[PDB]
Design a protein around this ligand. Sequence first.
Ligand SMILES: O[C@]1(c2ccc(-c3ccccc3)cc2)CN2CCC1CC2
Length: 284
Amino acid sequence: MTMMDMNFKYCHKIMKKHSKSFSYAFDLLPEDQRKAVWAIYAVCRKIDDSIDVYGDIQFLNQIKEDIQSIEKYPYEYHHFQSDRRIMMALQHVAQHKNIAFQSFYNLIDTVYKDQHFTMFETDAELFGYCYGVAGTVGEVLTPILSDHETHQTYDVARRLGESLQLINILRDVGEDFENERIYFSKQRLKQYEVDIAEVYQNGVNNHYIDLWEYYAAIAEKDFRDVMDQIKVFSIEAQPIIELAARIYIEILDEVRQANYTLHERVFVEKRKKAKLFHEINSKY
Ligand SMILES: O[C@]1(c2ccc(-c3ccccc3)cc2)CN2CCC1CC2
């Protein structure tokens, strides 16, 4: 292994550790593309996990400064302040591909603001959060997953990212509540007569299920609109993106099967991921 191979292998480790779903699908990309995905994904994870290193913004600021150095001087040698392996890999990618730097900065800004989290008043605020933490990730991946990007390409990738974040929220209601976070909006909770603390204590009820299903219907519609526009992506990436999206959306059925439990994290087992691969592979 070369030094740079070592950097990418580490990025792969971070991706596979965090998400078996996205690693299962994106590891099927041609080598140069999967490596680029690993690096971008790893940067986004490090940003997501940054505050708890010390308990403050120090590491996040270092990551931002590193990315800024890459943007301004992609062909110069940098003494990176954050995680050198990840930044070396990102810089390698940036030397070869268009990186939407402002999308990283939007992600970083969203993570900083999350320090001062208060519940979202409206769904518009929740969806703004989904953009910041996940639509941004779609935007940064866009040039890796398409041959000739247009506004449409970014729009579809951004929509997919946001759909996936809403699925993540729908899987994690219980664990998020334990961590003093509720992502359903105050308006929708009031409309549906749902109190998450009360449901965590007492179990689901029809009010909670109707609320959960309200958001699930949004994620599902967005998913279908993405599939309908899958041809924005490169021929090689199309079945891979369909696989990633389908593996993730299968989580919704897993929640339903587990009676919407707030007390464990449901999952799509590897064998079911493979079943989805076969169903897609046969279609392509
Ligand atoms: O990191 C996320 C992600 C967001 C977006 C894409 C994407 C993949 C391909 C095309 C467009 C978007 C992948 C992963 C954001 N969030 C929910 C799911 C995972 C984990 C936390």
